[PDB]
Coordinates of C-alpha atoms and ligand atoms in Angstrom, one line a residue:
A1 CA -17.4 -23.0 40.1
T2 CA -16.6 -20.2 42.6
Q3 CA -13.2 -18.6 41.9
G4 CA -11.0 -16.2 43.8
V5 CA -12.0 -17.4 47.3
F6 CA -9.3 -18.9 49.5
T7 CA -9.2 -20.2 53.1
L8 CA -6.1 -19.3 55.0
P9 CA -5.2 -20.4 58.6
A10 CA -6.9 -17.9 60.8
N11 CA -5.1 -14.8 62.3
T12 CA -2.2 -15.3 59.9
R13 CA -0.6 -12.5 57.9
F14 CA -0.4 -12.7 54.1
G15 CA 0.7 -10.7 51.2
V16 CA -1.4 -9.7 48.2
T17 CA 0.0 -8.2 45.0
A18 CA -1.6 -7.2 41.7
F19 CA -0.3 -6.7 38.2
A20 CA -2.0 -5.2 35.2
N21 CA -1.9 -6.4 31.5
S22 CA -4.8 -4.7 29.7
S23 CA -5.7 -1.5 27.9
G24 CA -8.6 -1.2 30.4
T25 CA -7.9 0.2 33.8
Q26 CA -8.0 -2.6 36.4
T27 CA -9.5 -2.4 39.9
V28 CA -8.8 -5.2 42.4
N29 CA -10.6 -5.5 45.8
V30 CA -9.6 -7.8 48.6
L31 CA -12.3 -9.0 51.1
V32 CA -11.1 -10.5 54.4
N33 CA -14.1 -12.1 56.1
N34 CA -16.5 -10.4 53.7
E35 CA -15.1 -6.9 54.5
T36 CA -13.2 -4.8 52.0
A37 CA -9.6 -4.7 53.3
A38 CA -7.5 -3.5 50.3
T39 CA -8.1 -2.1 46.9
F40 CA -5.7 -1.4 44.0
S41 CA -6.2 0.4 40.7
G42 CA -4.0 1.1 37.7
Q43 CA -3.4 0.5 34.0
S44 CA -0.5 -1.3 32.4
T45 CA 0.2 -3.2 29.3
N46 CA 3.5 -4.2 30.9
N47 CA 2.7 -6.2 34.0
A48 CA 3.2 -3.1 36.3
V49 CA 2.4 -3.6 40.0
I50 CA -0.7 -1.7 40.7
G51 CA -0.7 -2.5 44.4
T52 CA 0.7 -4.6 47.2
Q53 CA -0.2 -5.0 50.9
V54 CA 0.3 -7.2 53.9
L55 CA -3.0 -8.3 55.5
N56 CA -4.3 -10.6 58.3
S57 CA -6.6 -13.5 57.7
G58 CA -8.7 -12.8 60.8
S59 CA -10.9 -15.2 62.6
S60 CA -12.5 -16.6 59.4
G61 CA -9.5 -17.0 57.1
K62 CA -11.8 -16.3 54.2
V63 CA -10.0 -14.2 51.7
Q64 CA -11.7 -13.3 48.4
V65 CA -10.2 -11.3 45.5
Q66 CA -12.5 -9.4 43.1
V67 CA -11.6 -7.7 39.8
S68 CA -13.6 -5.2 37.7
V69 CA -12.7 -2.9 34.8
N70 CA -14.6 0.4 34.7
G71 CA -17.3 -1.3 36.8
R72 CA -17.6 -4.5 34.7
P73 CA -16.7 -7.7 36.7
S74 CA -13.9 -9.6 35.2
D75 CA -14.1 -13.4 34.8
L76 CA -11.8 -15.0 37.4
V77 CA -9.7 -18.2 37.5
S78 CA -7.8 -19.2 40.6
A79 CA -5.9 -22.0 42.3
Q80 CA -3.9 -22.5 45.4
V81 CA -0.5 -24.2 45.4
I82 CA 1.7 -25.5 48.3
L83 CA 5.4 -26.1 47.9
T84 CA 7.3 -28.4 50.3
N85 CA 4.2 -28.6 52.5
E86 CA 4.8 -25.1 53.9
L87 CA 4.9 -22.3 51.3
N88 CA 1.4 -21.2 50.0
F89 CA 0.5 -19.3 46.9
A90 CA -3.1 -18.4 46.1
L91 CA -3.2 -17.3 42.4
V92 CA -5.9 -15.3 40.5
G93 CA -6.1 -14.4 36.8
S94 CA -8.9 -12.4 35.2
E95 CA -10.3 -11.6 31.8
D96 CA -12.0 -8.3 31.0
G97 CA -12.7 -8.9 27.3
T98 CA -12.6 -11.4 24.5
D99 CA -9.0 -12.6 23.9
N100 CA -9.1 -14.8 27.0
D101 CA -5.5 -14.3 28.0
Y102 CA -6.8 -14.0 31.5
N103 CA -3.9 -11.8 32.6
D104 CA -5.8 -8.5 32.5
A105 CA -5.4 -8.2 36.2
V106 CA -3.2 -10.9 37.9
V107 CA -3.3 -11.3 41.7
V108 CA -0.9 -13.2 43.9
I109 CA -1.4 -14.1 47.6
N110 CA 1.3 -15.7 49.6
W111 CA 2.0 -16.9 53.1
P112 CA 3.4 -17.5 55.7
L113 CA 5.3 -14.2 56.1
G114 CA 8.1 -13.1 58.3
Ligands
ZDC201 C1 -4.3 -4.5 25.5 C2 -5.6 -5.4 25.6 O1 -6.6 -4.9 26.5 C3 -7.7 -5.7 26.7 C4 -8.9 -5.6 25.9 C5 -9.1 -4.2 25.3 O2 -8.6 -3.9 24.3 C6 -7.2 -7.0 27.3 O3 -8.4 -7.9 27.6 C7 -6.4 -7.7 26.3 O4 -6.0 -9.0 26.8 C8 -5.2 -6.9 26.0 O5 -4.4 -6.8 27.2
CA202 CA1 -7.7 -10.2 28.2
CA203 CA1 -4.3 -8.8 28.6

């Protein structure tokens, strides 16, 4: 199934934050309505934040996270979670190799803000 694609209420601000846990250098792209809106890169074996930014959902609400390592697309897993019917997390893990820890780049989207 498709992973890394989330529908947010339209014209709503949201945060996105990426962490790295791999020997390979991670690159994360964020597409809002199929247009590249943020990109992070870095390397960490220690969960370092390689990027963070507030974005807007736009008219579509379609947010999609992508991850690649030196050009090779990582395999994604994702889910959305809602707490107390109000607080939203969209979560993404990714695997760039063979050990299937799926934490190579870890991305977290959250909303509402403010
Ligand atoms: C340090 C390692 O780097 C990668 C592979 C190479 O080596 C990751 O896929 C592993 O999970 C682990 O973080
Ligand atoms: Ca891995
Ligand atoms: Ca890892």
